[PDB]
């Protein structure tokens, strides 16, 4: 169901974090993810993986894999993405506007003072909700770009992911 896309998403995210952001698991993480709070977990194992580097390419890079991953989706799958934009981000959007609207959402949301100017190297994440298939638990990875800015885009993308499992 959604698992493939998430993995596929996660892989392009790391593949493109190296090829463009020039990062490595061995790279020193300026910011690191502390704890992952799910208010209602009904089948999701969420792990953090460090692909830290040094942010606009991180941001530009994460946008690429999302766009490419959305494009790969079957049009009849992709029709589900706008409902989860409204639910997860309170964004009004449609199939043809996904790439732009998300783009500007992350550009606008994640380039805000609250993000860049925050003094915590260990940042938490809170997620309302996440479901897993009975017997088949959704397994997801939070790629720690290493900067507030990049993690914001990761977060936004994770809020859409978890929202999908409903």
């Amino acid at each position, epitope marked *: 169901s959604i698992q493939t896309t998430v993995n596929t998403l996660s892989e392009r995210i790391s593949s493109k974090l190296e090829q463009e952001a020039n990062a490595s698991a061995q790279t020193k993480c300026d910011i690191e993810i*502390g*704890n992952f*709070y*799910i*208010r*209602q*977990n*009904h089948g999701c194992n969420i792990t953090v993986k460090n692909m830290c580097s040094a942010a606009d390419a991180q941001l530009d890079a994460v946008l690429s894999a999302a766009t490419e991953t959305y494009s790969g989706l079957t049009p009849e799958q992709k029709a589900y993405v706008p409902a989860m934009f409204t639910a997860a981000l309170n964004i009004q959007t449609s199939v043809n506007t996904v790439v732009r609207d998300f783009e500007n959402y992350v550009k606008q949301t994640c380039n805000s003072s609250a993000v860049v100017d925050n003094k915590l190297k260990i940042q*938490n994440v*809170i997620i309302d909700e996440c479901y897993g298939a009975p017997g088949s638990p959704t397994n997801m990875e939070f790629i720690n770009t290493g900067s507030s800015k990049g993690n914001c885009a990761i977060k936004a993308l994770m809020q859409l992911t978890t929202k999908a499992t409903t």
Partner: antibody
Amino acid sequence: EVQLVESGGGVVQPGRSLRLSCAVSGLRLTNSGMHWVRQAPGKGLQWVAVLWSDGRNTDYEESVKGRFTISRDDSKNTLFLEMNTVGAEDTAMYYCVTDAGGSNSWEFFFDHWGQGTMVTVSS
Amino acid sequence: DIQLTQSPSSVSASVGDRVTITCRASQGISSWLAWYQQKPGKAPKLLIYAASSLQSGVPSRFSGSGSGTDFTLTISSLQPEDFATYYCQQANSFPFTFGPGTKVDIKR
């Protein structure tokens, strides 16, 4: 019914250490997130720290991060707050509380409260 | 951090009065808001969760409402045992913060 019973309070000198205990009946800690909440004399309530159901993940209010350690002993179903570098700002009634959430959810509100244990930090 | 303010700072009532306390959050918190009751010398006790859900056992004359930034806690018919200080609390994000309290005393 869920019973939470704190102990360990007392008078303590600045910079030194203390351990508060909260004995819990009616519920297994492995099945509940847990918190500590303090109340300085004459003041409001302030959240201190949270321990996960798994007994190991944790978070802290900024002011006490580094100095306090929240943990538990499953064998005894007891929650603990280890206070190591106490200043007079830490004077307070310390309340052990339960997150209404269990091993698969978080609510971040506090449905059961202990009777309280008072810590006075003074020279 | 999320600041919670409470109005009125105090209130005096007779037994049977309708009493309403307000809690305003510095930022939107949806319905992640709870209210506690506390009496002198005693631990807080939870009354309302998720803005409008009454905690089991709590007398039916307590209710809450609101979502976003502005919330209310109403006692439809104050009873001698309701004279106490009331605190609201946000459950949206760390650190979990509390309002300053609103004391309800016996009118004379």
